[PDB]
Design an enzyme around this catalytic site. Structure first.
Site, PDB file in Angstrom:
ATOM      1  N   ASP A  13       2.467   6.803  -1.807  1.00 38.66           N
ATOM      2  CA  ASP A  13       3.074   7.717  -1.325  1.00 38.66           C
ATOM      3  C   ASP A  13       4.100   8.479  -1.892  1.00 38.66           C
ATOM      4  O   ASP A  13       5.228   9.088  -1.710  1.00 38.66           O
ATOM      5  CB  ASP A  13       3.074   7.274  -0.014  1.00 38.66           C
ATOM      6  CG  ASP A  13       4.456   6.215  -0.045  1.00 38.66           C
ATOM      7  OD1 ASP A  13       4.706   5.764  -1.201  1.00 38.66           O
ATOM      8  OD2 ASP A  13       4.390   5.642   1.042  1.00 38.66           O
ATOM      9  N   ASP A 122      -2.730  -3.223   0.748  1.00 36.87           N
ATOM     10  CA  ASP A 122      -2.808  -0.853   0.277  1.00 36.87           C
ATOM     11  C   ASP A 122      -2.441  -1.446  -1.501  1.00 36.87           C
ATOM     12  O   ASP A 122      -0.998  -0.723  -1.368  1.00 36.87           O
ATOM     13  CB  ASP A 122      -1.753  -0.739   1.367  1.00 36.87           C
ATOM     14  CG  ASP A 122      -1.495  -1.048   2.276  1.00 36.87           C
ATOM     15  OD1 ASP A 122      -2.514  -1.260   3.197  1.00 36.87           O
ATOM     16  OD2 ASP A 122      -0.302  -0.769   2.949  1.00 36.87           O
TER      17      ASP A 122
END
Length: 208
Positions: A13, A122
Site C-alpha cells: 500500500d 502480510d
C-alpha cells in the site's frame, strides 16, 4: 523468542509503516522511511502520505533473495503481542503448503496489520494489492484501487510493467522465487535480524 504456525498475505500500500515512528520499540533507529521517490530519506516524524503527509515506504524495502533464501519485510499480527515485541523483529519461516512449500523466507517486521486471531504475516510485495489502505496513488500515480485488485493485486508477471520501474524487481520476485503462491501457510521462528535486512531498514532491536 516467538515461534509457531501462521498464515501469510501479500500487500503493498506504499504507506509509512507503523514501526517507522519513534517510541514503538527499543531500537537503534525507527525503520527508515523515504520521500515520494522511494530513495531519499525523510524524517521519521514526518507524517505519512497515507495520512496526507509526504513519507512513504522505501524502494529498499522490497523482497529479494540471497542464494536460495528469500528476504523481505512484512506486517505481522503475532498472537496477542504488542509492537514493543514485534517492531523490527525478524522471523524466518518455512512455507508449508504451496508451490513454494519447503522454501525459506526471512522477513523483518516493519508494520502491524489487522488484529485477526493467531499469527498473520502480510508480506510486502509490490503489486500484491493495497488492502485497507493505499498511499500508492499519491506516491506513484497508481489507480484508485491500486495495481490490479485491491486485494491480491495483479495477476500476471506481464502486468509488472504497470508498476513503477523502481518496484519492478519486487513485483517480479512474486512470480519467480515466490511462484505467485496464494497465501502460503508456514511455520516460523524468531531469529536475530540479519544485516542484509537491517542495513536496509536501519532498525535494530537494541536491548539485544
Amino acid at each position: 523468542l516467538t515461534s509457531g504456525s501462521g498464515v501469510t498475505t501479500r500487500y503493498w500500500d506504499c504507506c509509512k509503516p507503523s514501526c517507522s515512528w519513534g517510541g514503538k520499540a527499543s531500537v537503534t533507529k525507527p525503520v527508515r522511511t523515504c520521500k515520494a521517490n522511494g530513495n531519499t530519506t525523510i524524517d521519521s516524524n514526518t507524517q505519512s502520505g497515507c495520512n496526507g503527509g509526504s513519507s512513504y515506504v522505501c524502494n529498499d524495502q522490497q523482497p529479494f533473495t540471497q542464494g536460495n533464501v528469500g528476504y523481505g519485510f512484512a506486517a505481522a499480527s503475532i498472537s496477542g503481542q504488542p509492537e514493543s515485541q514485534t517492531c523490527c523483529a525478524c522471523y524466518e519461516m518455512t512455507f508449508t503448503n504451496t508451490a513454494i512449500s519447503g522454501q525459506k523466507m526471512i522477513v523483518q517486521v516493519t508494520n502491524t496489520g489487522s488484529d485477526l486471531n493467531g499469527n498473520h504475516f502480510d508480506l510486502m510485495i509490490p503489486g500484491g494489492g493495497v488492502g485497507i489502505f493505499n498511499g500508492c496513488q499519491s506516491q506513484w500515480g497508481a489507480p484508485s484501487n491500486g495495481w490490479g485488485q485491491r486485494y491480491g493485486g495483479i495477476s500476471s508477471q506481464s502486468e509488472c510493467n504497470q508498476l513503477p520501474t523502481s518496484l519492478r524487481a519486487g513485483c517480479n520476485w512474486r512470480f519467480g522465487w515466490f511462484k505467485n503462491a496464494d497465501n502460503p501457510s508456514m511455520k516460523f521462528t524468531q531469529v536475530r535480524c540479519p544485516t542484509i535486512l537491517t542495513q536496509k531498514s536501519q532498525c535494530v532491536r537494541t536491548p539485544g
